mmCIF file of C-alpha atoms in Angstrom:
data_model
loop_
_atom_site.group_PDB
_atom_site.id
_atom_site.type_symbol
_atom_site.label_atom_id
_atom_site.label_comp_id
_atom_site.label_asym_id
_atom_site.label_seq_id
_atom_site.Cartn_x
_atom_site.Cartn_y
_atom_site.Cartn_z
ATOM 1 C CA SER A 1 193.310 321.408 -14.636
ATOM 2 C CA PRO A 2 193.021 318.701 -17.295
ATOM 3 C CA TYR A 3 194.024 315.830 -15.012
ATOM 4 C CA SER A 4 193.316 315.526 -11.297
ATOM 5 C CA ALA A 5 195.744 313.207 -9.441
ATOM 6 C CA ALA A 6 193.848 314.052 -6.230
ATOM 7 C CA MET A 7 190.561 312.635 -7.624
ATOM 8 C CA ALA A 8 192.419 309.645 -9.038
ATOM 9 C CA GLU A 9 193.758 308.819 -5.542
ATOM 10 C CA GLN A 10 190.348 309.408 -3.972
ATOM 11 C CA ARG A 11 188.795 306.933 -6.475
ATOM 12 C CA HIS A 12 191.580 304.519 -5.782
ATOM 13 C CA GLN A 13 191.008 304.706 -1.976
ATOM 14 C CA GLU A 14 187.215 304.112 -2.546
ATOM 15 C CA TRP A 15 188.147 301.028 -4.580
ATOM 16 C CA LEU A 16 190.582 299.783 -1.933
ATOM 17 C CA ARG A 17 187.800 300.174 0.642
ATOM 18 C CA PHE A 18 185.636 297.786 -1.382
ATOM 19 C CA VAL A 19 188.578 295.387 -1.822
ATOM 20 C CA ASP A 20 189.151 295.375 1.955
ATOM 21 C CA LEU A 21 185.437 294.991 2.698
ATOM 22 C CA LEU A 22 185.285 291.901 0.463
ATOM 23 C CA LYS A 23 188.572 290.541 1.960
ATOM 24 C CA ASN A 24 186.972 290.691 5.390
ATOM 25 C CA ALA A 25 183.646 289.199 4.139
ATOM 26 C CA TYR A 26 185.606 286.128 2.826
ATOM 27 C CA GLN A 27 187.267 285.840 6.259
ATOM 28 C CA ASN A 28 183.864 285.904 7.984
ATOM 29 C CA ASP A 29 181.909 283.809 5.376
ATOM 30 C CA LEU A 30 179.743 286.776 4.383
ATOM 31 C CA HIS A 31 181.295 286.965 0.866
ATOM 32 C CA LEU A 32 178.315 285.391 -0.935
ATOM 33 C CA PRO A 33 175.642 287.731 0.494
ATOM 34 C CA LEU A 34 178.025 290.725 0.140
ATOM 35 C CA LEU A 35 178.562 289.891 -3.501
ATOM 36 C CA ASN A 36 174.792 289.584 -4.041
ATOM 37 C CA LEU A 37 174.328 293.025 -2.481
ATOM 38 C CA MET A 38 177.135 294.710 -4.410
ATOM 39 C CA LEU A 39 176.548 293.082 -7.851
ATOM 40 C CA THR A 40 173.488 292.691 -9.998
ATOM 41 C CA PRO A 41 172.441 289.192 -11.187
ATOM 42 C CA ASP A 42 173.614 290.229 -14.728
ATOM 43 C CA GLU A 43 176.968 291.475 -13.354
ATOM 44 C CA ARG A 44 177.418 288.183 -11.501
ATOM 45 C CA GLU A 45 176.661 286.138 -14.650
ATOM 46 C CA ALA A 46 179.062 288.322 -16.644
ATOM 47 C CA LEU A 47 181.819 287.548 -14.129
ATOM 48 C CA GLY A 48 181.190 283.796 -14.327
ATOM 49 C CA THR A 49 181.421 284.047 -18.135
ATOM 50 C CA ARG A 50 184.604 286.182 -17.979
ATOM 51 C CA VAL A 51 186.331 283.455 -15.981
ATOM 52 C CA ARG A 52 185.637 281.024 -18.928
ATOM 53 C CA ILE A 53 186.816 283.672 -21.427
ATOM 54 C CA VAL A 54 190.107 284.117 -19.573
ATOM 55 C CA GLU A 55 190.459 280.318 -19.282
ATOM 56 C CA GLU A 56 189.927 279.868 -23.105
ATOM 57 C CA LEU A 57 192.182 282.733 -24.106
ATOM 58 C CA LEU A 58 194.864 281.162 -21.926
ATOM 59 C CA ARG A 59 194.204 277.658 -23.417
ATOM 60 C CA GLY A 60 194.232 279.186 -26.940
ATOM 61 C CA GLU A 61 192.359 276.271 -28.573
ATOM 62 C CA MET A 62 188.897 277.825 -29.092
ATOM 63 C CA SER A 63 188.097 279.474 -32.437
ATOM 64 C CA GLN A 64 186.710 283.023 -32.646
ATOM 65 C CA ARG A 65 183.430 281.536 -33.854
ATOM 66 C CA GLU A 66 183.302 279.062 -30.888
ATOM 67 C CA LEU A 67 184.162 281.881 -28.417
ATOM 68 C CA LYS A 68 181.283 283.975 -29.865
ATOM 69 C CA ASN A 69 178.715 281.157 -29.948
ATOM 70 C CA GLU A 70 179.634 279.589 -26.566
ATOM 71 C CA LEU A 71 180.466 282.589 -24.384
ATOM 72 C CA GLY A 72 178.985 285.568 -26.262
ATOM 73 C CA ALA A 73 182.506 286.871 -26.715
ATOM 74 C CA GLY A 74 182.766 288.918 -30.012
ATOM 75 C CA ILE A 75 185.955 290.375 -31.545
ATOM 76 C CA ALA A 76 185.566 293.448 -29.192
ATOM 77 C CA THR A 77 185.433 291.338 -26.020
ATOM 78 C CA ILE A 78 188.185 288.973 -27.147
ATOM 79 C CA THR A 79 190.490 291.917 -27.892
ATOM 80 C CA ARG A 80 189.740 293.571 -24.534
ATOM 81 C CA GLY A 81 190.285 290.259 -22.703
ATOM 82 C CA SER A 82 193.574 289.858 -24.592
ATOM 83 C CA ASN A 83 194.870 293.363 -23.774
ATOM 84 C CA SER A 84 193.964 292.756 -20.138
ATOM 85 C CA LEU A 85 195.891 289.498 -20.111
ATOM 86 C CA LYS A 86 198.882 291.316 -21.713
ATOM 87 C CA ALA A 87 198.744 293.997 -19.038
ATOM 88 C CA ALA A 88 198.580 291.478 -16.177
ATOM 89 C CA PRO A 89 201.618 290.657 -14.041
ATOM 90 C CA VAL A 90 203.273 287.433 -15.024
ATOM 91 C CA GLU A 91 202.693 286.013 -11.505
ATOM 92 C CA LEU A 92 198.922 286.318 -12.118
ATOM 93 C CA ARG A 93 199.052 284.762 -15.606
ATOM 94 C CA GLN A 94 201.098 281.815 -14.297
ATOM 95 C CA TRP A 95 198.806 281.331 -11.342
ATOM 96 C CA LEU A 96 195.735 281.474 -13.602
ATOM 97 C CA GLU A 97 197.219 278.892 -16.000
ATOM 98 C CA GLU A 98 197.755 276.561 -13.000
ATOM 99 C CA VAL A 99 194.341 277.114 -11.452
ATOM 100 C CA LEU A 100 192.146 277.464 -14.534
ATOM 101 C CA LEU A 101 193.729 274.815 -16.749
ATOM 102 C CA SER B 1 166.012 274.781 -17.533
ATOM 103 C CA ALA B 2 167.137 273.846 -13.991
ATOM 104 C CA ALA B 3 170.233 272.293 -15.725
ATOM 105 C CA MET B 4 171.357 275.630 -17.277
ATOM 106 C CA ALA B 5 170.383 277.418 -14.070
ATOM 107 C CA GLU B 6 172.711 275.112 -12.135
ATOM 108 C CA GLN B 7 175.422 275.635 -14.786
ATOM 109 C CA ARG B 8 175.286 279.401 -14.442
ATOM 110 C CA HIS B 9 175.417 278.966 -10.658
ATOM 111 C CA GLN B 10 178.579 276.824 -10.777
ATOM 112 C CA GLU B 11 180.166 279.368 -13.148
ATOM 113 C CA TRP B 12 179.440 282.147 -10.579
ATOM 114 C CA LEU B 13 180.792 280.042 -7.695
ATOM 115 C CA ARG B 14 183.916 279.243 -9.682
ATOM 116 C CA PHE B 15 184.562 282.993 -9.895
ATOM 117 C CA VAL B 16 183.846 283.387 -6.115
ATOM 118 C CA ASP B 17 186.328 280.494 -5.442
ATOM 119 C CA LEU B 18 188.925 281.900 -7.780
ATOM 120 C CA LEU B 19 188.790 285.321 -6.084
ATOM 121 C CA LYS B 20 188.863 283.722 -2.580
ATOM 122 C CA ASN B 21 192.070 281.908 -3.614
ATOM 123 C CA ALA B 22 193.509 285.118 -5.124
ATOM 124 C CA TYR B 23 193.085 286.841 -1.773
ATOM 125 C CA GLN B 24 194.882 283.886 -0.052
ATOM 126 C CA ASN B 25 197.731 284.299 -2.540
ATOM 127 C CA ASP B 26 197.772 288.097 -2.508
ATOM 128 C CA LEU B 27 196.815 288.173 -6.208
ATOM 129 C CA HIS B 28 193.436 289.753 -5.644
ATOM 130 C CA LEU B 29 194.346 293.243 -6.870
ATOM 131 C CA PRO B 30 195.640 292.121 -10.235
ATOM 132 C CA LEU B 31 192.878 289.546 -10.563
ATOM 133 C CA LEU B 32 190.224 292.207 -10.021
ATOM 134 C CA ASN B 33 191.937 294.457 -12.578
ATOM 135 C CA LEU B 34 191.727 291.628 -15.119
ATOM 136 C CA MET B 35 188.076 290.730 -14.344
ATOM 137 C CA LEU B 36 186.500 294.180 -13.977
ATOM 138 C CA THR B 37 186.632 297.232 -16.137
ATOM 139 C CA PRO B 38 187.787 300.574 -14.727
ATOM 140 C CA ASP B 39 184.200 301.840 -14.764
ATOM 141 C CA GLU B 40 182.996 298.701 -12.956
ATOM 142 C CA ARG B 41 185.621 299.124 -10.230
ATOM 143 C CA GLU B 42 184.628 302.773 -9.792
ATOM 144 C CA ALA B 43 180.985 301.778 -9.588
ATOM 145 C CA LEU B 44 181.861 299.309 -6.825
ATOM 146 C CA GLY B 45 183.779 301.898 -4.796
ATOM 147 C CA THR B 46 180.817 304.234 -5.133
ATOM 148 C CA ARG B 47 178.380 301.487 -4.180
ATOM 149 C CA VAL B 48 180.189 301.010 -0.866
ATOM 150 C CA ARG B 49 179.518 304.689 -0.090
ATOM 151 C CA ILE B 50 175.913 304.392 -1.230
ATOM 152 C CA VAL B 51 175.449 301.420 1.149
ATOM 153 C CA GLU B 52 177.214 303.313 3.975
ATOM 154 C CA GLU B 53 175.029 306.424 3.565
ATOM 155 C CA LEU B 54 171.808 304.348 3.218
ATOM 156 C CA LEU B 55 172.580 302.565 6.433
ATOM 157 C CA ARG B 56 173.565 305.879 8.188
ATOM 158 C CA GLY B 57 170.182 307.233 7.136
ATOM 159 C CA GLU B 58 171.301 310.911 7.258
ATOM 160 C CA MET B 59 171.486 311.845 3.576
ATOM 161 C CA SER B 60 168.255 312.520 1.720
ATOM 162 C CA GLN B 61 167.639 311.185 -1.803
ATOM 163 C CA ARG B 62 168.603 314.635 -3.114
ATOM 164 C CA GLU B 63 171.802 314.725 -1.098
ATOM 165 C CA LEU B 64 172.735 311.209 -2.275
ATOM 166 C CA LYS B 65 172.323 312.411 -5.862
ATOM 167 C CA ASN B 66 174.372 315.579 -5.109
ATOM 168 C CA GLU B 67 177.238 313.928 -3.227
ATOM 169 C CA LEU B 68 177.543 310.529 -4.816
ATOM 170 C CA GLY B 69 175.905 311.094 -8.210
ATOM 171 C CA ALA B 70 173.464 308.295 -7.290
ATOM 172 C CA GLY B 71 170.087 308.733 -9.048
ATOM 173 C CA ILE B 72 166.767 307.344 -7.959
ATOM 174 C CA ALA B 73 167.142 303.987 -9.637
ATOM 175 C CA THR B 74 170.572 303.389 -8.149
ATOM 176 C CA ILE B 75 169.461 304.379 -4.639
ATOM 177 C CA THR B 76 166.393 302.132 -4.999
ATOM 178 C CA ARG B 77 168.606 299.193 -6.115
ATOM 179 C CA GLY B 78 170.775 299.799 -2.955
ATOM 180 C CA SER B 79 167.706 299.969 -0.677
ATOM 181 C CA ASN B 80 166.111 296.902 -2.242
ATOM 182 C CA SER B 81 169.440 294.984 -1.903
ATOM 183 C CA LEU B 82 169.727 295.900 1.838
ATOM 184 C CA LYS B 83 166.162 294.693 2.357
ATOM 185 C CA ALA B 84 166.942 291.429 0.536
ATOM 186 C CA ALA B 85 170.245 290.836 2.421
ATOM 187 C CA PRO B 86 170.527 288.407 5.361
ATOM 188 C CA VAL B 87 170.340 290.203 8.679
ATOM 189 C CA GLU B 88 173.819 289.123 9.659
ATOM 190 C CA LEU B 89 175.232 290.976 6.629
ATOM 191 C CA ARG B 90 173.299 294.149 7.365
ATOM 192 C CA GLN B 91 174.428 294.076 10.976
ATOM 193 C CA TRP B 92 178.043 293.449 10.011
ATOM 194 C CA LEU B 93 178.009 296.253 7.410
ATOM 195 C CA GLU B 94 176.691 298.623 10.053
ATOM 196 C CA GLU B 95 179.715 297.665 12.228
ATOM 197 C CA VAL B 96 182.307 297.972 9.556
ATOM 198 C CA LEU B 97 181.022 300.870 7.427
ATOM 199 C CA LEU B 98 179.846 303.212 10.162
#
């Protein structure tokens, strides 16, 4: 069939298993070495940069040019980061505005 | 540049701190949806199984490719990362994943 809900739930349960693994690593102070095992150095740098992208999209002061030349974020990335922010639950957006700004 | 190096490090730690706080506030699921693409999340769920089967040591390289779609470079990245990990992590992962 064209869409498999069974495989979607199996993928979801594999993802939850990672989420739970990392939850427990934070509890036991093994989060930093776990993250180094599970993410490449480039993936880690990308995540650090994405935090600044979300912060700037939320602040809404940086120009497209400044976003591109300070964070490598082109019109594709900005759009994707915007759609993600639009899709996020308000409780997350509010919490992020508090914490990040 | 040790300055830039230290800048990139603080940016990474800020993410680690942000996610730690999201877990404390039960916002981790939506935070991770915002910060990772669907393909990145799938890759992470598959990487947990790769790590589990590497540690179990039962599946051959061929079987890892067959079952998990993990090719030689991916398996080698997993093996290299287990060798680079602190022993306490390896020992914990054996407890929790097996």
